[model samples]
Target: KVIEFHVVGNSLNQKPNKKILMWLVGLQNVFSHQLPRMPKEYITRLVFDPKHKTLALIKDGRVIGGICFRMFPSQGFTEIVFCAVTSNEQVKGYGTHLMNHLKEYHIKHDILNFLTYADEYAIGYFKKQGFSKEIKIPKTKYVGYIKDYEGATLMGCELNP
Candidate 1:
């Protein structure tokens, strides 16, 4: 079944800041044991943006996924900063749904390009969503693991009208 998706920002309406923290911590557990200071304050900024451009994915009243980006409304492109789904829900459509929301945001705002850094392990999954790799660094660390670093692939998607 295609799960019903509710997109929101970090507001009083979106409960479960703890759950959101858990998702990020869990991602570290599977992808990288090195944990970083979570309970981030930036999420609040995005949610509170007067323009309402950033978004979070809530399902069953829980924030299972999210994506953050810098939108260049004039240039017709947005640079994605962060995007992820909880560990327990891997292979589900949540990641794709979150990406779709970004795409929708692009179209609504007349954005032509969407770009983000995808780690080596995430290449296949992003590709499955029709994102194309524009470049790949032999070893890059955007987040998650810090010490023993692996490479990263930068991917982009061109939206269709």
Candidate 2:
């Protein structure tokens, strides 16, 4: 089966329709299975939050991976809250495909900065995606907008578009 990408979330102007809610649930399911260390309850909470959006990687009608993020349009950046590929789906290039889709989406929207908190296990992947530990964004732009994890290091990606 061919892979697919979808941006799933309720827009700021209106409530989510049933289709959107279902996609949100699917993303929650993927995160629960792929992100073992994160609390499933927390994942559900954020995935359903209207402010956050998930770029879902779908194959065979189910989500295989996604990156949950929040865009701060005024500040010109997006915080990547969670990113994971299901165990069986990793290393087949789906993670990169998912990330590339997200990049192009934001590029069209004009938000060029990507911020993420990557733990030791996930840092390798983010690094390969062109994310760097050197914070090019100013403190004023994202100082308190994104959360920090005790064991995770912050990485920033500046998109060309």
Candidate 3:
């Protein structure tokens, strides 16, 4: 019961079901709480976006952490929008596990690149996760495709899968 990684989203033909809906609600809570710098409404919007999928960490049937990402298969990379574990759950290896799970999932999908803009508070975490400020993605590829933040550093991880 340690690694209950559940991916939920309205990706393509996937229908809205009770299970996915439940996980979405839980993910929204986790995002809203952990990402206090972000507008709660915006977090909700991104978390529930049809094109975005959240890899959720569930324990005791409750959400503990999640990574919300949008896959750009055409761009050959995925943009990680949000990743957080609850405050009480920090330092428990959940963060690493959640990121690792996301990587393997993307590897199987043949999309082996990850891009994220890390704010000062998150830069260390991303670095520990193998992301570097010197992005491997070409400028033309993600310049206009990914969202840019005012004070965040753009980082990327190229996976060998």
Candidate 4:
């Protein structure tokens, strides 16, 4: 059955810092074996970066899914850098909800494109969210160690004007 959920902006002040960090740590654990190697400091930086906008999916007043993205307003685009839904919450529409939230927010701000680098397992998920293979990205785009990851796909989605 399809379940309904709500989306909200996530911030250090929105939830207890301990709760937020715990959730992120747990999510990282879920993909630890398959995701590209990243320093713990990088994860901590993403969570604290003001330019990284985070959207959380809430079910029963608690966050069950979230996506973190960097907005490049002058460039009219954004890139989703991190995404996850609680293990028990997968396939429940929370991921899509968070993605849609990002799109809507960017659209309102006149940013019409979204981009992300996804590994094999996540390519399908991004495609289902309306993203397609993209061959180019901003030179300044932060791809992390994705270049070392074989079969990683760069994906993009455009919101029509």
Candidate 5:
């Protein structure tokens, strides 16, 4: 049986939900080996933050993975704040599915660039998603914090015509 996946985009600022916030926190814990200690306050705020957007990967109506990104509409780009899949779901193409969904959303909105930092272990994975090492961090409206993945490689991808 194939579990067809689909993405649901949430404009958290428009409709804040505690359950989703908790789910995101749980994902942070599931990927603690690769992520930092995300403050509860930050998660709470992200749910209502107008600048941010959350994308959830659902299969059979169950959430398997989610990604959070800050969109800079004026700048025509976005930065991935966090991305994770259930521990048991890793390396099964779920992560890529989530990213491609995001890419399509961005393109439809006229956003053509993406930026994110990845640790050594995650750099290869991001590369496989079409992100390349960014020689330097580009100017953006918001600066993302890199705690656990400190000194990680900065990567980016440009959505071209």
Candidate 6:
């Protein structure tokens, strides 16, 4: 059976439960080393102000994947601060589904661009989702100094029409 998710904006009243949030954050930390230590405050902020378009992908009344981004017309773009799916549930099309929803949301809002940094492991995934390599960091610059992935890759999706 295929998994179906209900994508919704961040609503404090309907925000992900604490258990789901912890699990999702753990999934992100396990897959990507670049993310800062899972800070409780960060997640709280997203839930408190879901009006900014932060979203949660819920399946079976549970949170499976989520993405948080900040939109900026002055920069003519949006920055994806966080995106993640449960580790055991990856490659099952949940990620692609979430990404497609986000892209559509941005396009509808007149967002001309979307940006994020991806490591080698995630580069191909981003490419498949229509994002291209927009910036290349010859070296990694984070807490862990991860250098095995051939450096950090900045990916972007251009929606100029």
Give candidate 4's whole-model lDDT.
0.64
lDDT of 5 by residue, 19-80 (tens): 55555445445444335545556554663455666676655545567777877777667778
Error of 4 at 97 (Å): 1.4
The count of backbone overlaps in candidate 2 is 0
Each prediction's total of clashing residue pairs, residues at least 3 apart in sequence or on different chains, is 2, 0, 0, 0, 0, 0
How do all the candidates rank in terms of TM-score, highest first?
3, 2, 5, 4, 6, 1
Using TM-score as the yardstick, the better of models 2 and 3 is 3
Better of 1 and 4 by TM-score: 4
Question: In model 5, what lDDT does residue 93 have?
Answer: 83
Go through the candidates in order and give each one's C-alpha lDDT.
Answer: 0.55, 0.87, 0.88, 0.64, 0.66, 0.60
Per-residue lDDT of model 3, residues 106-146, tens digit only: 99999989999898889989999999999777988877868
Expressed as tens digits, the lDDT of each residue in 1-161 for candidate 1 is 23444433334565457754443333333222211222344444443443333455555655555665666565456666556666677577778877877788678878767666666666787798788876322223222222212355667778879
lDDT of 5 at 104: 88
RMSD of 2: 1.6
How far residue 99's Cα lies from its native spot in candidate 2, in Å, is: 0.7
Segments of candidate 6 deviating more than 4 angstroms: 1-52, 135-151
Estimate the TM-score for candidate 5. 0.73
- CA shift at 68, candidate 2, in angstroms? 0.7
Error of 2 at 39 (Å): 1.0
Clashing pairs in 5: none
Q: What is the Cα root-mean-square deviation between model 4 and the actual structure?
A: 4.6
Task: Give the TM-score comparing model 6 with the true structure, all chains together.
Answer: 0.63
Please give each candidate's TM-score.
Answer: 0.60, 0.92, 0.94, 0.70, 0.73, 0.63
Which is better, 2 or 3, measured by lDDT?
A: 3
Error of 6 at 26 (Å): 9.8
Query: Residue 66 of candidate 4: its Cα lDDT?
Result: 70
Sliding window of 10 residues with minimal summed lDDT for model 1: 30-39
